[PDB]
Amino acid sequence: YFPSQMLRTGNNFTFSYTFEDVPFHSSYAHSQSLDRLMNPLIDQYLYY
Amino acid sequence: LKHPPPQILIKNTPVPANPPAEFSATKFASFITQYSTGQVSVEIEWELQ
Numbered sequence: 285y286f287p288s289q290m291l292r293t294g295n296n297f298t299f300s301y302t303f304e305d306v307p308f309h310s311s312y313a314h315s316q317s318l319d320r321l322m323n324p325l326i327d328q329y330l331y332y
Numbered sequence: 333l334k335h336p337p338p339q340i341l342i343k344n345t346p347v348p349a350n351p352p353a354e355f356s357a358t359k360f361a362s363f364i365t366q367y368s369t370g371q372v373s374v375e376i377e378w379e380l381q
């Protein structure tokens with residue numbers, strides 16, 4: 285119930301599609317971690 | 333005068349003496365001791381009656 289193209293030996297079918305805008309896939313690993321993201325040499329101005 | 337000659341303010345900018353070789357956040361209090369000198373000119377036009 286869908287219009288479809290019919291082919292015999294001499295025929296061929298072609299079609300092109302365009303991808304939608306999508307974020308690049310992150311093909312890398314982080315060289316730091318969330319917890320270790322500060323300056324190892326300096327104090328903070330915050331207290332706990 | 334409602335609007336007199338303004339106050340002219342002058343100051344020698346501080347010059348930190350040699351700082352520690354390791355970062356310290358405490359207030360800086362070591363400075364090269366210095367003074368300045370120069371001439372100052374003031375011209376005034378007065379109106380006579």
